[PDB]
Structures are given as C-alpha cells and as structure tokens.
Amino acid sequence: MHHGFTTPSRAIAVLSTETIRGNITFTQVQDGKVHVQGGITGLPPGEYGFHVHEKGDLSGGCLSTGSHFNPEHKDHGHPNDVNRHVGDLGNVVFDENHYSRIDLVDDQISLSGPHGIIGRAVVLHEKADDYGKSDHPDSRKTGNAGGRVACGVIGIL
C-alpha cells in the first residue's frame, strides 16, 4: 500500500560538541507558525547567533551547512523584520548557569514547502548576531556572529 504525502508535524536538531549539549525541537502549531523549544548547556553567559543554514551537510563540519536558509532572496534581519531570511532566528541567551532556554514562535520557518527546514542545519554561533544593523560588511549577510561552535541537521521527530 502506497500513500500520499504527509507533512511531518515535528522536527528536532541535536547539538553535541566536546563542551556543548542541546536539543531543539520544532513543532508545527496553528496559524502557519512553528514553536521552537529546547535547551542547550555549555556556553558562558551571553547572547549567541542562532540560525537555520541552507544545507544539512556536515561532511565539512559546520562549514558545509553553507549560508543562511534564504529562499525569499532577502537580506539578513532580525526575526521580527520583514526583511530577514527564513533561517534568521536571532540570538540565544546563556544564563549564569551556562544554560540556554529556547522558547519561541516563528512565522517564517516551516516544516514543509519552500520554507521547509527539514534536512537543513541548525547552527549555533560563538558570538552574537547583530541583526544586519551594523556596518561590519558581513552584517547584512550573516549578521556578524563569528564562528560556528555547533550544528546539527534538522530531523523528523
């Protein structure tokens, strides 16, 4: 027996480095929204750039996930900007205890269609996203979030 297409209603990405452990779950909710929730330990307190990159390709570590998932051909942006990339989910915040609570809802990423992020990569950044609001010349493209301290492919949960 052969079926039509089912859109997954939940996905997850797993970050594990020597220092870093995190699960980030992405759950399809009402009104074309996705509910992104997880928690990650292992960075000092502060803000770090958190994005979906285009490729679920780890053959070159985080470098192979390429650039920010951008099907709408827009500029780098704040998640609340109209001019953002689909993958531009802003900054995560590590507390004094070295633990990030992730808990947000984004109306641009999806679990299917042209904004589908299944098979794409979550990338955690070593410093903070600037929202394309600086005059570093990367700022309009990548924010300016430094290296890529961790990444994992978005899988079906």
Q: Residues comprising the binding site for Cu(2+)?
A: 3, 51, 53, 68, 73, 125
Q: Could you tell me the two tokens for 48? A: 């770090």
Q: Is residue 11 within the footprint of a second copy (CB under 8 A)?
A: yes
Contact track, Zn ion, 75-104, x by CB under 5 A: -x--------x--x----------------
Q: Which is nearer to Cu ion, 42 or 49 (CB)?
A: 49
Q: Are strands 121-125 and 46-53 parallel, antiparallel or unpaired?
A: antiparallel
Q: List the catalytic residues.
A: 51, 53, 68, 76, 85, 88, 125, 148
Q: Is residue 39 within the footprint of a second copy (CB under 8 A)?
A: no
Q: In the 3-class helix/strand/coil scheme, how is the chain assigned residue by residue?
A: CCCCCCCCCEEEEEEECCCCEEEEEEEEECCCEEEEEEEEECCCCEEEEEEEECCCCCEEEEHHHCCECCCCCCCCCCCCCCCCCCCEEEEEEECCCCEEEEEEEECCCECCCCCECCCCEEEEECCCCCCCCCCCCCHHHHCECCCEEEEEECEEC
Q: Is residue 88 within the footprint of a second copy (CB under 8 A)?
A: no
Q: Which is nearer to Zn ion, 70 or 100 (CB)?
A: 70
Size of the site for a second copy (CB under 8 A): 34
List the single partner that 140 binds among Zn ion, a second copy, Cu ion, none, CB under 5 to 8 Å by kind.
none
Q: Which is nearer to a second copy, 20 or 58 (CB)?
A: 58
Q: CA angle, 134 as apex, 41 and 81 as ends, to 5°?
A: 75
- Which of 55, 127, 133, 141 is in the footprint of a second copy by CB under 8 A? 55
The footprint of Zn ion on residues 107-146 (CB under 5 A) is none
Question: Which residue ranges are tagged as binding site for Zn(2+)?
Answer: 68, 76, 85, 88
